């Protein structure tokens, strides 16, 4: 039931891949990166592609999933 | 099949094949576009970070539309 903002990595991660099952494959790199809630809210496009080395495809699909619960 | 099911693959066919004096199948390999992020990509990502001249980039993104 918990929100957004408060989600720990792993939540962040099933709501990804629970969304688009075609993210699941960089489901450790949001491990790697410590993507939780907070985190989450905060990321871009260009911060994917520049520091997690995520595709501009991906990128844009996890932006959208980002938009919905921002 | 809707665009939205369009694999990578089903994208860099579209692209390549589309009528035109350029080839812009390698730039979309390079970014994983599928479907999913074909109908997501707008001229803003194409030129800014794809580096595509504006007007290509706006046919491509109305094709899509059109298509769609």
Same mark, same amino acid.
């Given at each position: 039931?918990?929100?957004?903002?408060?989600?720990?990595?792993?939540?962040?991660?099933?709501?990804?891949?629970?969304?688009?099952?075609?993210?699941?494959?960089?489901?450790?790199?949001?491990?790697?990166?410590?993507?939780?809630?907070?985190?989450? =809210?905060?990321?871009?496009?260009?911060?994917?592609?520049?520091?997690?080395?995520?595709? =501009?495809?991906?990128?844009?699909?996890?932006?959208?999933?980002?938009?919905?619960?921002? | 099949?809707?665009?939205?099911?369009?694999?990578?693959?089903?994208?860099?066919?579209?692209?390549? *094949?589309?009528?035109?004096?350029?080839?812009?199948?390698?730039?979309?390999?390079?970014? *994983?576009?599928?479907?999913?992020?074909?109908? @997501?990509?707008? *001229?803003?990502?194409?030129?800014?970070?794809?580096?595509?001249? @504006?007007?290509?980039?706006?046919?491509?993104?109305?094709?899509? *539309?059109?298509?769609?």
């Amino acid at each position: 039931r918990s929100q957004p903002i408060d989600w720990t990595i792993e939540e962040v991660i099933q709501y990804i891949e629970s969304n688009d099952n075609s993210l699941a494959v960089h489901g450790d790199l949001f491990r790697k990166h410590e993507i939780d809630g907070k985190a989450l =809210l905060r990321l871009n496009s260009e911060r994917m592609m520049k520091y997690m080395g995520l595709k =501009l495809g991906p990128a844009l699909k996890i932006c959208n999933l980002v938009n919905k619960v921002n | 099949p809707p665009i939205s099911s369009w694999s990578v693959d089903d994208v860099s066919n579209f692209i390549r *094949e589309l009528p035109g004096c350029q080839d812009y199948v390698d730039d979309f390999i390079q970014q *994983e576009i599928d479907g999913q992020a074909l109908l @997501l990509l707008k *001229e803003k990502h194409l030129v800014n970070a794809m580096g595509m001249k @504006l007007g290509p980039a706006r046919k491509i993104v109305a094709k899509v *539309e059109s298509i769609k």
